[model samples]
Target: EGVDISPKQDEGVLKVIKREGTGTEMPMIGDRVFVHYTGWLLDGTKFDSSLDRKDKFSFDLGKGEVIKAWDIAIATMKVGEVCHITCKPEYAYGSAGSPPKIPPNATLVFEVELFEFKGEDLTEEEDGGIIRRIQTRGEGYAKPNEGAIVEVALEGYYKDKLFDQRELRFEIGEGENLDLPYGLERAIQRMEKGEHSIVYLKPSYAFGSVGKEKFQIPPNAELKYELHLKSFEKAKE
Candidate 1:
């Protein structure tokens, strides 16, 4: 009934988009994503459903809170996208299976529709002040350490303002050249190589109460940085 968009023949999860989403925006590792789903066995016998509950489900994307197949498949979903995802037991409950529902080593399928997601929160305090929405994902889980030498490309802005644009290298610790804001240094350290993110910074982490005098910024203004981490070398012991 729909076109096959699976990754490969019997490799990972198989996907068929019943209806395409409106945009290209995707959820990242820590995004709070919401979806409604209906699951069934390969033989088409129904198992469970979020739709049956009359309430959609929510989970932090890619945080190991759900099945491995869900983490893998849902990351590619966009708002309003309804996709049929099929996965092997290894990606679901594995050989043990879910009692009274799924059999051992069974293949399962789900029709999942993504409703929405909030961007990944990058703050240490679990506050929403610092938000990072990744445009393109990076290769691995490796991140920069303090004093690590790193390379980056950045576009700084606030609404209509474009206050900074540069491609440069810098150390992750303080007192370096450019005297970048502390929030900015933290954001870069959280990045893996090749990660592209649009990070929104609250005023506390940005210009602070005084604002950047020469940068056309207003007091208490939140700033946004488009960052791409090209690469980094870990700090030496």
Candidate 2:
């Protein structure tokens, strides 16, 4: 009992051979998906296998980070379902091709198993404007206190476009002239050292009336921040 799954009109993809998964939840664009896969040329030459490495691959669905075939095939799968998919070069590597292993315009086959997905958690702030989701757990249970020196890795995004990413140091609640947005400071204050999180801020908490045109951020645009706390130290006397 197999079927054809095609995400795009006029673009045919895998002829699915099994349907053993339990649910109907499919990842939308921008949702993070983790999967295990093995790929081969139509000639049956194995090119790559995450299974051989024993590590799963994770990427945001519909993002160009992965090959077009993968985004199309994996999105239609259910959690824990494995399927064999044959892809045309137009959907695979095409003429540019993946070197050494994949020839130019190679038609490829892949066995993909969808594992899990990380959708936008979308937790509302106390006032119901800012939303936060903890993406990775931190080291210690202790949270940073007022006047603590903290180091963080931050990425600013307007929709899927990443505007900035950098390592920064600042003293929380010390009134230091840090270049970070107020909403970022508020979100950081809630995280412990070594934690990673995604915070969504409304315009009121982000770049209010004037946006950073140089960065292509429009006025009053909602912002998504991916933050990682590198370390923290209590303020000195």
Candidate 3:
């Protein structure tokens, strides 16, 4: 009875979010989206690219001004997100084809980066960091601000490799001795005492190009952390 397919299904576009955006806003159907893209054929023929023209392409998403597959995938992207997408003949120009630059029924591949999106929806964040999976929910209405002394239990990993696991006590804005990602400092303040949660940090907020050798984290690796705010002593400053 379910006629519609999910985005992961073969009938629709094949999309991989290569880099998650730091922004929280998701584009709406009528929104105008500004993006940079490079298109290629299945045989790896270079077709067109926004970068080559040195211009940002703006279009109304889900408005059929572009190909069907572009609408489907672009609507799912957030600002600053980059996607590698595949569009089969049915989603492209189909059998009619565009000629010259494109052959009839030719499948297409695109590297699309969404930069600015207009109409949108969103929720809160610690500036930016991906956090989810609440194992043990928090208590009270107050979370730490800068200078609050906090005690937290964290188990960090890159995939199955346990980089480190320990309970740490440190001041909120002050420097600590651990080599954890910079995102941890800002994210912790967003939680209340007794809050236990998990977070995913991209390379920008994590290691960037400088990988931690002592911890065995690779260069520009995405890291995960199981963090618990055991308690805090309010602001120390």
Q: Global lDDT for candidate 2?
A: 0.76
- Model 1, residue 91: what's the lDDT? 84
Give the runs in model 3 whose Cα sits over 4 Å from its true position. 1-8, 120-237
lDDT of 2 by residue, 1-237 (tens): 234566664444665745466688766555678888888898999988998665689887765888887787777778888888888788888999988999998888888888897554333444645666666668676776678888999999998799988898888874224446676777777777788888888887777777767779888889888999889887665
* Residues 1-237, model 3: lDDT tens digits: 111223656655777878888666666554568999999998999889999666799887666889988888886788889988888888888899888999998888889999987531111543434444445558775988888888999998898688889898888766345676666776787777898877677676777788888898878888888899988888754
**Worst ten in a row by lDDT for model 1:** 1-10
Clashes of each: 0, 0, 0
Error of 1 at 29 (Å): 3.9
Candidate 1 similarity to native, TM-score? 0.85
Superposition TM-score, candidate 2 onto the true structure: 0.51
Report how far residue 84 has shifted in candidate 1, in Å: 2.6
Residue-level error in angstroms, candidate 3, position 209: 54
